[PDB]
Amino acid sequence: GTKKGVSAAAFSGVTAALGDVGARWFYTWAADPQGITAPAGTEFVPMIWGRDSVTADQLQRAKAAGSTLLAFNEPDLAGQANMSVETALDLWPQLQATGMRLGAPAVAYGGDTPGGWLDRFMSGAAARGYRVDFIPLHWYGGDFSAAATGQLQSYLQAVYNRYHRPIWLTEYALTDFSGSTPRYPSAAEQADFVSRSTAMLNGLSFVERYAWFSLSTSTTPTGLYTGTTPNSSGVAYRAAG
């Protein structure tokens, strides 16, 4: 398959972990690999994370580093890119002018909601004659049962049905963020979800790429690897197509 990728940072053993897990692509939330040496066959995808990365220098660096460009990360959240739709649209021509295959900003929430951030962005892009080649999404499930895969699927399908752009899933895991501090599944629940979700994602033609959040436990408790050693979730992700 071409779909399976990961987000990553340059922790000790990252090059080995990327190859071990079989990542076809990766990204780093930045315009370059952030110190990661990718294994052969693992494609880096640059990102323009927020307003401060919309510079001629960053855009040229991104275009030198890869072929596909991801736009702003969670502009809908104050603790992430924290950007209005208007600001994102006004910056958009600079990203579009790279000529790269271009992903929408990845909203944290509400991608299928009429009048939400993504909907207003896509509507304004269409009105302005802008190009948006694909839509990357984020999804963190708070229901840790076998039902989680179908919940994720329904969100992806809703966003595809609304805008008819191919979908990337650039962050996903089981994590309940409803509370003052994140709540996580058991290791077994997580590994089962990795298996079921990747099988689902591999069968949806409109999902081009997906990336578990994240490769390393140094990034998040939902990490797949500690150093070069996969946990049961990393083993399940490695086994996925």
Cα–Cα dist 8/39, whole Å: 13
**101 touches Na ion by CB under 5 A:** no
Judged by CB, which is closer to Na ion: 40, or 127?
Answer: 40
Nearest to 136 by CA among 154, 118, 124, 148: 118
**51 touches Na ion by CB under 5 A:** no
Number of residues that bind Na ion (CB under 5 A): 2
Q: Which residues, 64 to 83, sit near Na ion by CB under 5 A? A: 67
Judged by CB, which is closer to Na ion: 48, or 207?
Answer: 48
The DSSP 8-state label assigned to residue 115 in this structure reads T
Shortest spacing between CB 69 and Na ion, in angstroms:
9
Judged by CB, which is closer to Na ion: 51, or 63?
Answer: 63
Are 48 and 31 spatial neighbours (Cβ–Cβ below 8 Å)? yes
Q: Look up tokens 């370059």; give the residue.
A: 32
Among 24, 51, 61, 63, binds Na ion (CB under 5 A): 63
Strands 43-44 and 68-70: unpaired
Judged by CB, which is closer to Na ion: 44, or 155?
Answer: 44
Shortest spacing between CB 56 and Na ion, in angstroms:
15
**120 touches Na ion by CB under 5 A:** no
> Could you please report the per-residue DSSP string of 9-45?
---TTHHHHHHHHT-SEEE-SSSS-TT--PPTT-EE-
> Could you please report the per-residue DSSP string of 69-88?
EE--B-TTSTTTT---HHHH
Shortest spacing between CB 40 and Na ion, in angstroms:
18
**Stretch binding Na ion (CB under 5 A), from 32-40, 57-65, 139-147, 209-217:** 57-65
Length of the chain: 241
**24 touches Na ion by CB under 5 A:** no
Cα–Cα dist 100/120, whole Å: 23
Shortest spacing between CB 60 and Na ion, in angstroms:
10
Query: Which residue's beta carbon is nearest to the bound Na ion?
Result: 63
Contact residues: Na ion, CB under 5 A = 63, 67
